[PDB]
Design a protein around this ligand. Structure first.
Ligand code: MET
Length: 257
């Protein structure tokens, strides 16, 4: 059956944006030459694909950054591994909206006692708190690779309430809160207007932790899928695919190969 078919790979992804479709189209097209067939399982929530991969419902996934992976392994006693890097996806603080329009043109306009929604998984929660500091809204007593929670807020001059919600729910909150940090995987399908960005995460040598990856089981190299996974990586790391991602996700996803 499929799990023991050397020429089929089942890939776990989030609900596909148009740019996701186009890039996986090109990968598929390139993999015909190798007689590999791709199948996709789409997930709606970040807690799902690593569970599905451990359970062997999928052969690899392509949805997360290194941090999320390491953290997920820890919370779950998992042993999933990184097989390759894909793109980085600098995250934004987006203005809350009223009848669809931005309430604020810059972070400094966020009112005293206002509310900001962020992801509630350790690594994206922390990522978002670092963006708030960069946007000039808060100060943290922790720096660099060190994880942050609300407990690390040592300055909050506008007395903002930080509402920790699921990464999948930050977008939905924008109509109810003053601003939210929203992963692009969610921001694009929610059809958020990116003019409402009040701050875009910066990319430096310290951003390797937010590089997205393809993940597999620890023993994938001894599995029926080893050859197909290697071929998939070669197909992903082409100019053809790099061009597709840059064209269709310029400023959203940036290939790192
Ligand atoms: C599930 S960890 C977050 C991954 C998302 N694609 C990002 O780079 O923000």
């Amino acid at each position: 059956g499929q799990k023991n078919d050397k020429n089929t790979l089942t890939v776990g992804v989030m609900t596909m944006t148009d740019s996701d479709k186009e890039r996986w189209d090109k990968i598929e097209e390139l993999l015909k030459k190798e007689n590999i067939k791709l199948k996709f399982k789409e997930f709606t929530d970040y807690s799902q694909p690593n569970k599905a991969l451990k359970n062997g419902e999928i052969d690899i996934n392509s949805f997360q950054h290194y941090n999320f992976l390491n953290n997920w392994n820890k919370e779950n006693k998992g042993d999933l591994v990184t097989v390759a890097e894909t793109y980085i996806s600098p995250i934004n603080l987006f203005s809350g909206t009223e009848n669809g329009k931005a309430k604020y043109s810059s972070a400094k306009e966020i009112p005293n006692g206002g509310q900001i929604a962020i992801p509630n998984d350790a690594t994206n929660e922390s990522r978002a708190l670092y963006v708030l500091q960069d946007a000039g809204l808060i100060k943290l007593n922790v720096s660099g690779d060190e994880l942050a929670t609300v407990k690390n807020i040592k300055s909050n001059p506008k007395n903002l309430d930080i509402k920790e919600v699921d990464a999948s729910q930050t977008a939905r909150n924008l109509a109810s809160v003053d601003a939210a940090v929203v992963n692009n995987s969610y921001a694009v399908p929610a059809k958020i207007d990116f003019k409402t960005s009040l701050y875009k995460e910066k990319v430096n040598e310290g951003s390797k932790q937010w590089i997205n990856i393809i993940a597999a089981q620890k023993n994938w190299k001894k599995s029926k899928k080893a050859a197909a996974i290697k071929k998939l990586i070669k197909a992903y790391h082409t100019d053809a695919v790099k061009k597709v991602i840059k064209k269709t996700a310029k400023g959203v996803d940036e290939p790192v190969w």
